[PDB]
Amino acid sequence: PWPASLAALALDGKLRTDSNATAAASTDFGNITSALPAAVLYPSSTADLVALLSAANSTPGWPYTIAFRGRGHSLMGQAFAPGGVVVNMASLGDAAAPPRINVSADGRYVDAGGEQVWIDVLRASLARGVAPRSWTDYLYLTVGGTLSNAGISGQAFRHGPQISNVLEMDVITGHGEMVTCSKQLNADLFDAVLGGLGQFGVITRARIAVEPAPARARWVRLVYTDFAAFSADQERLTAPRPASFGPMSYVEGSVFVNQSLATDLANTGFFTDADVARIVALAGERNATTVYSIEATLNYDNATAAAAAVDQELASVLGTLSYVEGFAFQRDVAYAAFLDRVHGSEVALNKLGLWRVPHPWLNMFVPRSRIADFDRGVFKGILQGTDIVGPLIVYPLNKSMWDDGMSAATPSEDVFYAVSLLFSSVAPNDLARLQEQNRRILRFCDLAGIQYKTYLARHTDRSDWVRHFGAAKWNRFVEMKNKYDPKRLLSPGQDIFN
Ligand SMILES: *Cc1cc2c(cc1C)nc1c(=O)[nH]c(=O)nc-1n2C[C@H](O)[C@H](O)[C@H](O)COP(=O)(O)OP(=O)(O)OC[C@H]1O[C@@H](n2cnc3c(N)ncnc32)[C@H](O)[C@@H]1O
Ligand SMILES: CC(C)=CCNc1ncnc2c1ncn2[C@@H]1O[C@H](CO)[C@@H](O)[C@H]1O
Ligand SMILES: *[C@@H]1O[C@H](CO)[C@@H](O)[C@H](O)[C@H]1NC(C)=O
Ligand SMILES: *[C@@H]1O[C@H](CO)[C@@H](O)[C@H](O)[C@H]1NC(C)=O
Ligand SMILES: *[C@@H]1O[C@H](CO)[C@@H](O)[C@H](O)[C@H]1NC(C)=O
C-alpha cells in the first residue's frame, strides 16, 4: 500500500519505470560497472523528494534503495540504486521560475540548488561580479555531488576544498524531514553530509562562499626533470606564511612519462610545438625517464596597471623557484576561460569517441613524507614501459584548511598530495591491464607502509571502509547513519552499509 503523496508522483508521471528511464540511470562516467534501478524519480520541486523519503521511512518493510543522480560522473556505480529508485536530481531545475541560483544582496555568498552544475553557478555569480573561491578542475558536476565527496582543484591549498566553503545547507534526511543546517544549527548533520558520500540525506540547497570576481588569470607552466626540485617548489608556492598564503591563486602539477612525452605535452593544450621540441630535447640531455610541470595562476582585475603589476609579482615569485633555467611558459586568459579549460577536452574526446570509454581512474591523497617514495615506485617504476592515455596530476594540499570533523577522510600529515592518475581505456585488454595496474599501485603503497586515503573510490569490504575513515571517525559515521538513514536506503552504490 502506497501513501497518497507517493501515489501522486506516479500519477503525475514523475515516477517512471520504462526501459528508457531505467537505462539512463544504470550507467556512469566510469563506464565499468552497471546496475538497473526498479524506478527513476524526476522531481519538479523539493516537496516531491519529501514525499519519496517520508514514504520510505513510514512504509514498513520498504525494499527500495534511493540514489541521487547529479550528473553521474561517479567512476564505480556510486550513483546507482540496484533494483531501487534513482532520483534524477537535474529535474529540480526544470522550471525557469523560481531561479535555482541566487547571489546574496550583500554579494558575500551564492545560494545554489543541490542539483545545479558548477558551470551555471559560475555564470550566475559572474553576472553579480562575484565567484566561488574553491573549484573542481571540470565544471560540469553538481553542487551536491562534489559536496558529498570534497571538491578539489588548484585553489584548495589556500581556501580548502569545496566542503570548507559552505555556510549552510538544506538537507532532506532519510526520515523525509527538510532540515536547514550549519556550524550553529544542526551541526552534526552539516558535518556528516559534507564528504558524506550521499549517506545521510539529499542536499537541496548549499550556501557557497564567494569572493569579488577577478577578470583575468596569468597562467604559467614551469618544467623540471628533478622530482625533488618539482615537489620542493610546489610546497614553497603553497606554504602558509607567518592562515595566510603566498601570491599564487592556483597550484597544480603534471607528471609526464618519457615514452609518450611529446604526445602528452602537445595534448596539454598549453604548449606550442616549439615548446614541446625544447622539453623533449631537455629530457634527452638529462636522460630523464619522467618530466614534471608545475601549473600555476595569478588572478588579477581589469585595472590599467594590473598587467604591469602582475609581471613584477610573477617575476618576484619565479625568482624564488628552481625550474630548469628558461623553462617558464606563460599564457594570459579571462578567468571564466581558465575555469572552464577542461570542457574543451570533453568536446574533443567525445567527437573522437574517447570520452564515453572506461575510466579506471586512480585518485588518492598521499602524505608529503612519502611522496618521493611514491614517485620512485610509481612514476619511475610501475608506469614505465606502459602506453599512458590521460593526464597524471600531482599537487600538495594543506591539512589546516580541511575540517576533520566533516565526513571526508584525509592523511594525518600537515601536507598531503592529491594524486590523480586519469587513465582512459583503449581496448578490453587495456581495461583489465589498467585495473590490475591500479591494484599493483595500491599493493606497492600498502607494502611500503604509505598511509594514503583514496578519493572518489568505493570500497567493497567493511574492513576497508573502517580503515578509510579511521576507527574513531567510523564510529561517528555509523552514529550519524543511524540518526539520518536508519533504514540504510541512501546511496547504496558506495557499498558502505549496502
Ligand atoms: C567525471 C569527472 C569527475 C570529476 C572530475 C572530472 C570529470 C571529467 N574532476 C574533479 C576535480 O577536479 N575535483 C574533484 O573533487 N572531483 C572531480 N570529479 C569527481 C566528482 O566530484 C564526482 O564524480 C562526484 O560524484 C560529483 O559528480 P556528480 O555531481 O555527477 O554526482 P554523482 O556521481 O551523480 O553522485 C555522487 C554520489 O553523491 C550522491 N549525491 C549526488 N548529488 C547529491 C545531492 N544533491 N545530495 C546528496 N547526495 C548527492 C549520489 O547519490 C552518489 O552517491
Ligand atoms: C581529482 C580529479 C578527478 C581531477 C580530474 N580533472 C580532470 N579530469 C579530466 N581531465 C582533466 C582534468 N584536469 C585536467 N584535465 C585535462 O588534462 C590536461 C591538463 O594537462 C588538459 O587536457 C586538461 O583539459
Ligand atoms: C560503456 O559505454 C559503451 C559505449 O557508450 C556502452 O556500449 C556500454 O554499455 C557501457 N558499459 C557500462 C558498463 O556502462
Ligand atoms: C625516451 O623515449 C624514447 C622513445 O620514445 C627513447 O628513444 C629514449 O631512449 C627514452 N629515454 C629514456 C631516458 O628512457
Ligand atoms: C640513462 O638512464 C637509463 C634509465 O634510467 C639507465 O639505463 C642508464 O644507466 C642511463 N645512462 C647514463 C649514461 O647515465
Considering its fold, how many domains does the chain have in total? 3
Q: How many C-alpha atoms does 484 have within 13 Å on its Cβ side?
A: 28
The residue range of the domain holding 375 is 216-455
Same domain membership, residue 345 and residue 307:
yes
The domain that holds 32 is classified in CATH as 3.30.43.10
The three three-digit cell numbers of residue 88, written as one number: 534524477
Q: Give one word for 393, left, alpha or beta, with left for phi > 0 and alpha for psi -120 to 50.
A: beta
Same domain membership, residue 116 and residue 82:
no
Closest CA to 30 of 364, 489, 435: 435
CA of 258 to the centre of ligand 4 (A): 6
Same domain membership, residue 222 and residue 177:
no
Q: Which of 28, 73, 264, 359 is catalytic?
A: 73
Is residue 422 lining ligand 2, measured as CB closer than 6 Å?
yes
Does the active-site annotation cover 175?
Answer: no
User: Taking each helix axis from N to C terminus, what angle separates 4-11 and 46-58, rounded to the nearest 10 degrees?
Assistant: 130
Is residue 58 lining ligand 3, measured as CB closer than 6 Å?
no
For residue 353, count other CB atoms closer than 10 A to its CB: 8
Count Cβ atoms within 10 A of the Cβ of residue 60 and give its class: 0-12 exposed, 13-18 middle, 19 or more buried.
exposed
CA of 285 to the centre of ligand 5 (A): 11
Centroid of chain to Cα 139: 10
Domain boundary among 152, 180, 215: 215
Centroid of chain to Cα 57: 31
For residue 390, report the phi and psi dihedrals to the nearest 5 degrees: 115, 160
Are residues 219 and 297 in contact, defined by beta-carbon separation less than 8 angstroms? Answer: yes
| CA distance linking residue 286 with residue 280, whole number of Å | 10
Same domain membership, residue 466 and residue 449:
no
Is residue 451 lining ligand 4, measured as CB closer than 6 Å?
no
CA of 72 to the centre of ligand 1 (A): 7
Is residue 34 lining ligand 3, measured as CB closer than 6 Å?
yes
Question: For residue 233, what is the enclosing H or E element?
Answer: helix 227-238
Pocket test for ligand 5, best of 226, 227, 287 (most atoms within 8 A of CB): 287
Same domain membership, residue 333 and residue 316:
yes
- Helix and strand numbers, DSSP H then E, in the chain: 17, 20
For 18, 85, 92, 144, the CA distances from 14, given in Å and listed in that order, are 12, 12, 11, 21
Is residue 349 lining ligand 2, measured as CB closer than 6 Å?
no
Same domain membership, residue 473 and residue 448:
no
Same domain membership, residue 52 and residue 180:
no
The domain that holds 310 is classified in CATH as 3.40.462.10
For 73, 268, 349, 381, the CA distances from 426, given in Å and listed in that order, are 19, 19, 12, 22
Pocket test for ligand 3, best of 31, 349, 351, 435 (most atoms within 8 A of CB): 31
Same domain membership, residue 31 and residue 141:
no
**Would you say the C-alpha torsion 110, 115, 121, 124 has a positive or negative sign?**
negative
String of b and e for 134-157 (b: at least 16 CB within 10 Å)? Answer: bbbbbbebbbbbbbbbbbbbbbbb
Residue partners of 427: CB distance under 8 A and separation at least 6:
none
Long-range contacts from 305-314, C-beta under 8 angstroms, 24+ separation: 306/216, 310/218, 313/247, 314/218, 314/220
Q: Which of 137, 211, 403, 413 is catalytic?
A: 137
Same domain membership, residue 462 and residue 426:
no
Resolution of the solved structure (Å)? 1.8
Q: Which of 115, 170, 191, 252 is catalytic?
A: 252
CA of 421 to the centre of ligand 2 (A): 10
Question: For residue 299, what is the enclosing H or E element?
Answer: strand 290-300
Does the active-site annotation cover 137?
Answer: yes
Is residue 146 lining ligand 2, measured as CB closer than 6 Å?
no
Does the active-site annotation cover 12?
Answer: no
Residue with CA nearest ligand 1 atom 44: 144
Domain boundary among 215, 238, 260: 215
Residue with CA nearest ligand 5 atom 13: 287
